[PDB]
Amino acid sequence: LSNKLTLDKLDVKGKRVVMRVDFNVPMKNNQITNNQRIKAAVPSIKFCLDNGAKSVVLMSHLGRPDGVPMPDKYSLEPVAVELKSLLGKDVLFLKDCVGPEVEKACANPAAGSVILLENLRFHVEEEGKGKDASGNKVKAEPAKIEAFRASLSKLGDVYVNDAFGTAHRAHSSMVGVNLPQKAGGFLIKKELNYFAKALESPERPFLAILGGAKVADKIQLINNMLDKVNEMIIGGGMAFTFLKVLNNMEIGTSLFDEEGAKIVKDLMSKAEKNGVKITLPVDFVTADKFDENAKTGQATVASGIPAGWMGLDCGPESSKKYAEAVTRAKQIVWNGPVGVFEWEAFARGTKALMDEVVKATSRGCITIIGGGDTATCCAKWNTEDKVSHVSTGGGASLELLEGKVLPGVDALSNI
Numbered sequence: 001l002s003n004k005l006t007l008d009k010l011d012v013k014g015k016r017v018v019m020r021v022d023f024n025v026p027m028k029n030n031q032i033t034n035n036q037r038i039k040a041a042v043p044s045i046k047f048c049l050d051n052g053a054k055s056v057v058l059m060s061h062l063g064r065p066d067g068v069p070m071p072d073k074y075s076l077e078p079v080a081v082e083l084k085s086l087l088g089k090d091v092l093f094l095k096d097c098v099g100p101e102v103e104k105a106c107a108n109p110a111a112g113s114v115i116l117l118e119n120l121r122f123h124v125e126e127e128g129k130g131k132d133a134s135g136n137k138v139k140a141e142p143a144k145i146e147a148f149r150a151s152l153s154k155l156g157d158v159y160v161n162d163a164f165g166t167a168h169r170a171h172s173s174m175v176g177v178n179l180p181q182k183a184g185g186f187l188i189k190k191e192l193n194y195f196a197k198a199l200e201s202p203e204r205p206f207l208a209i210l211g212g213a214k215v216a217d218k219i220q221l222i223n224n225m226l227d228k229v230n231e232m233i234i235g236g237g238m239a240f241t242f243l244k245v246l247n248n249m250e251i252g253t254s255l256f257d258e259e260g261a262k263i264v265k266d267l268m269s270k271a272e273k274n275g276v277k278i279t280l281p282v283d284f285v286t287a288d289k290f291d292e293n294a295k296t297g298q299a300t301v302a303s304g305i306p307a308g309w310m311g312l313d314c315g316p317e318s319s320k321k322y323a324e325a326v327t328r329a330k331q332i333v334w335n336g337p338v339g340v341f342e343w344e345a346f347a348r349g350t351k352a353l354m355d356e357v358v359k360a361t362s363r364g365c366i367t368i369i370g371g372g373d374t375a376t377c378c379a380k381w382n383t384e385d386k387v388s389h390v391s392t393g394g395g396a397s398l399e400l401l402e403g404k405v406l407p408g409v410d411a412l413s414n415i
């Protein structure tokens with residue numbers, strides 16, 4: 001960022017600001033479970049308003065609608081409502097993010113107008129791909145992508161990107177906006193500065209804790225991370241891929257990444273060569289279906305998971321092994337709950353791991369927890385202030401740990 005235009009050097013007096021934020025907040029039945037990512041953008045938004053912005057037009061994705069409109073499942077409308085509360089200002093919600101009606105509402109707003117656009121991923125051109133409404137994979141057309149970007153660019157005179165949590169995504173709203181000044185917000189500044197200091201020479205041992213459910217994405221990041229860390233917990237939804245390939249463990253209907261499976265053995269060889277201690281769980285809480293009211297069971301690696309059942313949390317021997325890796329660390333980066341922590345039957349391991357990480361912070365371990373869902377763990381159990389840093393970035397944070405530049409940063413104007 002030292003090299004890039006940032007919002008503190010952007011003259012906004014009388015300008016419309018179009019601002020990409022990560023408002024991809026966790027939900028249960030169109031209710032916001034954690035407004036952390038919303039609050040995190042407020043400093044950038046208030047700056048613009050305080051310094052005389054004509055308008056701030058906010059844009060984000062929510063979940064993975066795959067390029068089809070899904071207002072019933074994936075609308076940002078609840079986020080506009082929560083934003084109102086957080087800003088003390090009213091927020092005009094629009095039901096689309098591009099096209100003539102949107103351009104019109106954004107062309108010349110009343111001074112101080114805050115506008116939140118609908119889910120960008122209701123359009124295929126944001127990601128550059130998705131699925132048609134029948135579930136068949138489609139790829140977007142370049143001339144349509146270009147038009148999508150041109151339409152977004154009409155909505156502001158100047159562009160800010162404060163979407164740290166999405167900064168690893170080279171999507172239209174993140175790298176494609178064509179305006180003369182493209183400036184990083186304060187949340188991006190705050191996050192890049194923390195990780196720059198913490199990644200420069202990590203305290204050792206440096207433990208990465210990888211869990212969660214986006215197994216196809218995350219498994220592809222392990223290879224570079226193995227040059228940076230001394231230990232790695234591979235837990236949550238990611239473990240099953242590894243145990244299937246390594247132990248031939250019967251995993252039931254647990255998450256499994258078919259492509260990921262093909263590099264597991266390569267990753268474990270690299271880990272052995274780099275002296276990275278891999279800790280996989282050894283036991284599970286199982287469920288007879290993917291429901292919070294499912295019947296619960298126990299499984300071990302040796303027993304396997306029964307057919308039709310899925311592992312949704314680690315068990316007590318796993319928690320103990322996770323605790324011992326946490327006890328040995330001087331620095332930790334954790335992204336991905338180690339169970340379906342949202343559901344109380346499957347929350348105990350993630351809760352146990354959190355208690356250990358809080359303890360560790362107390363004896364001077366540098367502890368970093370990131371992700372839309374992993375940070376919600378901290379909100380759930382009131383630990384946001386009992387670890388060293390809660391980041392709004394999960395996958396974005398792991399890509400920094402890999403040593404990469406984030407495209408959403410790299411696309412900003414130079415100083």
Ligand SMILES: Nc1ncnc2c1ncn2[C@@H]1O[C@H](COP(=O)(O)OP(=O)(O)O)[C@@H](O)[C@H]1O
Pocket residue numbers: 211212213214235236237238255311312313335336337338339340341342370371372373374375393394395
């Ligand atoms: N064994 C599992 N099977 C399915 N989902 C899991 C498992 N363990 C954790 N999860 C889920 O992982 C999700 C979070 O994954 P992810 O989005 O990758 O993390 P973050 O948002 O912190 O980057 C949670 O919603 C949680 O329910």
Ligand SMILES: [Mg+2]
Pocket residue numbers: 371372373374394
């Ligand atoms: Mg997530």
